[PDB]
């Protein structure tokens, strides 16, 4: 508790709670992920939030369901996050 906090180099604890656009430098909250439906051999890139509809290229089946906030994937499929850059 004896530490002195400056505004140019904030600590990890206080920065992790701030709203985006309230940080020192604003930035996104979302990410992309590779989603593999059961079978179909195909890998698709899906947005985390993805308000639109998403269908697999091969099997023509829906992959995610829209939601206020993050999208939810169908029960079978499992995803994998991609690096920011």
């Amino acid at each position: 508790g004896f530490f002195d906090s400056d505004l140019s180099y904030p600590t990890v604890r206080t920065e992790r709670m701030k709203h985006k656009r309230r940080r020192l430098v604003q930035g996104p909250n979302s990410y992309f992920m590779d989603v593999k439906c059961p079978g179909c051999k195909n890998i698709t890139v899906v947005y985390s939030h993805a308000t639109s509809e998403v269908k697999c290229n091969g099997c023509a089946t829906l992959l995610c369901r829209p939601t206020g906030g993050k999208a939810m994937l169908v029960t079978g499929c499992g995803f994998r996050k991609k690096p920011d850059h």
Binding site: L7, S8, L24, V25, Q26
Partner: protein
């Protein structure tokens, strides 16, 4: 809405000095703000400051040292002739021994002691003491 970013920044700084803080954050900053700050820093009134860059108008972090008493913008930017420097000093300064009135001339932004030496004039920007 926000009409003057110079009046804004000088209000944030004088506010933080009143409370007793050690650092301030200023947004959105501009060229006129930075040149105003360099005049205060060169006379030894604020201390080190740094500009953080986003791909927009940046932000400024300024370190204080308890020497500033007040700083404020003058609006609208009236016109001052080289013979008119005293009249402004008598009005918005506590004494003529110390203090500064910052002008913008065609040579550049600079305080009234330097402006008198170069024998110029222009529009007033603010003051600090």
């Amino acid at each position: 809405t926000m009409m003057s970013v110079l009046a804004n920044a000088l209000r944030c700084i004088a506010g933080a000095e009143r409370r007793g803080k050690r650092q301030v954050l200023i947004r959105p900053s501009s060229k006129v703000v930075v040149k105003f700050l360099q005049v205060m820093q060169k006379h030894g009134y604020i201390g080190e400051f740094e500009i953080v860059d986003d791909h927009r108008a940046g932000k400024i972090v300024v370190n204080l040292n308890g020497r500033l008493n007040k700083c404020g913008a003058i609006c609208p930017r009236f016109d001052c002739t080289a013979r008119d420097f005293e009249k402004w000093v008598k009005n918005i300064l506590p004494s003529r021994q110390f203090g500064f009135v910052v002008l913008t001339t065609s040579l550049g932004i600079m305080d009234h002691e330097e402006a008198r030496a170069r024998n110029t004039g222009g529009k007033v920007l603010g003051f600090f003491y």
